[PDB]
Amino acid sequence: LPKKELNLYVGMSSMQKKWYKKILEKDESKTRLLNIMMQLRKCCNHPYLFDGAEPGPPYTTDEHLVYNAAKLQVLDKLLKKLKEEGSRVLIFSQMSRLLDILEDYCYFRNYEYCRIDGSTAHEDRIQAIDDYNAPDSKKFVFLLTTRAGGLGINLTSADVVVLYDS
DNA sequence: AACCGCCAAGGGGATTACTCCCTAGTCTCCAGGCACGTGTCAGATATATACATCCTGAGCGTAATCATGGTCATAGCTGTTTCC
């Protein structure tokens, strides 16, 4: 059985277009751009990563996060579809900090999962893998990094794997 | 949460060649600024008064202390009662 591949070209969120211009035109201000590569990469990845895109002193946790994000709207659609389809999904990303927001947004949707990140533990890696690969595991999603997570482990219990970033 | 390894990629510091035009040296020139006389004014001088202010009690207020009274507690005395 082969594998399918689709590249979900989604438009960059209009809400963060303010800050994306604020990065291109150097408009928010008075910070580093020593690696314009990464700065645009983080804005390409997620807006709240720039330390002030989340204005709330209580830091509200609601649909605004998926609202202000370009990708998570398609993610929310695909998570709803794959939940009914029973697809056991794996998510890969580069920024461990971004995964915190996904961990927070996983809490919002109340999914079971296990978060493996660079330098979590030794026994925690084993146990989180076991719970995810446990038979009939309801851990519908699985947070994982890119350069720390997928270098030899087998996840045949899963079928669909999604990249947040390239 | 520092440390350390790791990872790729712009980024700008380095190097080479060249051009050029601006500053240097000279040189001609002259009036600006510096010495050189001089009066006048604004600080210095010399009193006198006005005033602030400190000093030390003139006195006044305040509290601290001793005096003084009243009051209650306890002890002593005796009268009453009951018992043999």
Tell me the Cα Rg of chain A: 17
Query: Token pair for residue A48?
Result: 């709240």
Phi and psi at residue A89, in whole multiples of 5°? -100, 150
Residue reference for tokens 């669909």: A160
Gaps in chain A with C–N over 2.5 Å, residue before each: 27
Q: Which residues contact A42 (CB under 8 A, 6 or more apart)?
A: A49, A50, A95
Contact yes or no for A132/A139 (Cβ under 8 A): yes
Phi and psi at residue A149, in whole multiples of 5°? -95, -55
- A58 membership: H or E segment, kind and range: none
Between CA A91 and CA A49 the distance in angstroms is 18
Query: Token pair for residue A61?
Result: 């946790």
Which bases of chain B come closer than 7 Å to a protein CB? 9-11
Between CA A62 and CA A76 the distance in angstroms is 13
- CA→C1' distance for A80 and B38 (Å): 107
This PDB structure is determined at a resolution in Å of: 5.4
Q: Smallest CA–C1' separation from A119: which nucleotide?
A: B1
Structure-solving method: cryo-EM
Q: What is the DSSP letter of A11?
A: P
Query: Token pair for residue A144?
Result: 């994982």
Between CA A141 and CA A15 the distance in angstroms is 27
Q: Which residues contact A83 (CB under 8 A, 6 or more apart)?
A: A140
Q: What is the DSSP letter of A13?
A: P
CA neighbor of A158 nearest in space, from A121, A12, A144, A15: A144
CB atoms within 10 A of CB A142: 28
Judged on CB neighbours under 10 Å (0-12, 13-18, 19+), A23 is buried
The protein residues having a beta carbon less than 7 Å from any atom of strand B are A 36-37
A95-104 CB contacts, 8 Å cutoff, 24+ apart: A95/A42, A95/A45, A95/A46, A95/A49, A95/A165, A96/A145, A97/A49, A98/A45, A98/A46, A98/A49, A98/A164, A99/A143, A99/A145, A101/A46, A101/A48, A101/A49, A101/A65, A102/A143, A102/A164, A103/A143, A104/A61, A104/A65
